[PDB]
């Protein structure tokens, strides 16, 4: 299957409460492997998956130096953005950054990402061609001109289409037991009266990995795309995911509905019916 | 592994 590596960074200003909060998290596919928190005791990049603990001190010194350098960049960027938007130091503001790479089943590069948000709105992003920038507004156009004048894109492309892929391949081989696995969903149905004349049917998928799944409800074999409640896919806390999909049905015609479960871990898609 | 770009906004 296809794989990805992503880093997510959140910088939050804290008026009169000292330095901004900085949080960095690294993922391979739907597995977290590293964190940094400005407010934690270590002041180190920290492992969050057993396979990355195999990496030696040169790895960890390097990642710690790089993540501390990002924290300092974002501290200045909070100040810059206040200048660009004529905003005082009294308010709390948020910078978000994300970057990473996707590979196919052959572990060859598919695409890269580098993008920022300010107070929950798109700010600047590298375009899919890796050669140009999309700028949300006039402040972002100031950033874009600085990055164009300094030829930042060629340095960034070198990481996204090269270094990033090399790291991901290294992690996929060293983490193969954790990362190159599929856990098929354990499924079941619940039944609740909402009226004297209708009931909720709830299709459950539990303990699955990776997070991508499709739950669909059919009424006499037709998709209920308008009439289905689906919750957000949610972490179990043990490295697996959970989801459910519900339909409200005429009480006594439960047996007319089918739930359909599709996941990379299933040899064939599952069908479930209410069994009272 | 993290990117090493020095660029500021």
């Amino acid at each position, epitope marked *: 299957g296809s794989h990805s590596m992503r880093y997510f960074f959140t910088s939050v200003s804290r008026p009169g409460r000292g330095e901004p909060r900085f949080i960095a998290v690294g993922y391979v596919d739907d597995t977290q492997f590293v964190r940094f928190d400005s407010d934690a005791a270590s002041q180190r990049m920290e492992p969050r998956a057993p396979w990355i603990e195999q990496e030696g001190p040169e790895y960890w010194d390097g990642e710690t130096r*790089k993540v501390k*350098a990002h924290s300092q960049t974002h501290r200045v960027d909070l100040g810059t953005l206040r200048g660009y938007y004529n905003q005082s130091e009294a308010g709390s503001h948020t910078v978000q950054r994300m970057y990473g790479c996707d590979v196919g089943s052959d572990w060859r590069f598919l695409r890269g990402y580098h993008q920022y948000a300010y107070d929950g709105k798109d700010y600047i992003a590298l375009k899919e061609d890796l050669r140009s920038w999309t700028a949300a507004d006039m402040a972002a156009q100031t950033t874009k001109h600085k990055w164009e004048a300094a*030829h*930042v894109a*060629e340095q960034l492309r*070198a990481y996204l*289409e090269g270094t990033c892929v090399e790291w991901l391949r290294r992690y996929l081989e060293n983490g193969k037991e954790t990362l190159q696995r599929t856990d098929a969903p354990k499924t079941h149905m619940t039944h609740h009266a909402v009226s004297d004349h209708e009931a909720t049917l709830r299709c459950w998928a539990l303990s699955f990995y990776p997070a991508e799944i499709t739950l669909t409800w059919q009424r006499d074999g037709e998709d209920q795309t308008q009439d289905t409640e689906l919750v957000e896919t949610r972490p179990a806390g043990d490295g697996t995911f959970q989801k459910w999909a519900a339909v409200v049905v005429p009480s006594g015609q439960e047996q007319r509905y089918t739930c359909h479960v599709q996941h990379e871990g299933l040899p064939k898609p599952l069908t479930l019916r209410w069994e009272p | 592994g993290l990117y*090493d770009g020095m660029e500021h906004l």
Partner: T-cell receptor, first 110, second 110 residues
Framework: KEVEQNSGPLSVPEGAIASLNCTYSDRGSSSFFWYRQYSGKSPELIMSIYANGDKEDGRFTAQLNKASQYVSLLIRDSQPSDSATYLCAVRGTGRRALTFGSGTRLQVQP | AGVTQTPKFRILKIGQSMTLQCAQDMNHNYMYWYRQDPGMGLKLIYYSVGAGITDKGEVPNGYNVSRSTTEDFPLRLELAAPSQTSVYFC?????????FGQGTRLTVVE
């Protein structure tokens, strides 16, 4: 130590290729540069490279081999006015300043 | 429209103090001081990643710097010693290219 170049002088006949080489210790280094310094003058960037492969800019070629931790500059059709010190500069893992080699003095003989 | 470093030349007697001026008008976050002895490479004295932030390089003993402002990165020599006879370069960067000042040739005399 961190960035190694032969100090030369490197004597090259006019019209021949001058071959300048550089090795670096930090395997994770991201950014590689050639700087040219005329006698008594300041260093001036002449080539930037970030990925494995080669880059041309007129008579200059830079090539980066990250697996061998080796960086090269070629000067094709070398002229006496190319006579200068060539400094390899490398940015190490998580560094925010350049580390310079001690330079190779190139002497293109007429 | 670049890095303005003064003075070009200076004589100090042993124990005297001086300030080397460095200014840039490019709004660069990163500034640097290097020294270069005869026929040798650049060594980092001090660098700054932004206003109010300064850190030690490879050869900091002898010197002090301040980055009150984005534009200015003065280098203070506190107590001139003969080992400090050298050429001093100020540089700025946005991210990639390091832009060098004209340099300061300092001789310390008994």
């Amino acid at each position: 130590k961190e960035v190694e170049q032969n100090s030369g002088p490197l004597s090259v006949p006019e019209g021949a290729i001058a071959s300048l080489n550089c090795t670096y210790s930090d395997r994770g280094s991201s950014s590689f540069f050639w700087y040219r310094q005329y006698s008594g003058k300041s260093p001036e960037l002449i080539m930037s490279i970030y990925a494995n492969g080669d880059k041309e800019d007129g008579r200059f070629t830079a090539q980066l081999n990250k697996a061998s931790q080796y960086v090269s500059l070629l000067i094709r059709d070398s002229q006496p006015s190319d006579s200068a010190t060539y400094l390899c500069a490398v940015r190490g893992t998580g560094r925010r300043a350049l580390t310079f080699g001690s330079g190779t003095r190139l002497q293109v003989q007429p | 429209a670049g890095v303005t470093q003064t003075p070009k030349f200076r004589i100090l007697k042993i124990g005297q103090s001086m300030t080397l001026q460095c200014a840039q008008d490019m709004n660069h976050n990163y500034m640097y001081w290097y020294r270069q002895d005869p026929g040798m490479g650049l060594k980092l004295i001090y660098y700054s990643v932004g206003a109010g932030i300064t850190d030690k390089g490879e050869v900091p003993n002898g010197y002090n710097v301040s980055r009150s402002t984005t534009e200015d990165f003065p280098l203070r020599l506190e107590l001139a010693a003969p080992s400090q006879t050298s050429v001093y370069f100020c540089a700025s960067s946005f991210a990639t290219e390091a832009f060098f000042g004209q340099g300061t040739r300092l001789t310390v005399v008994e």
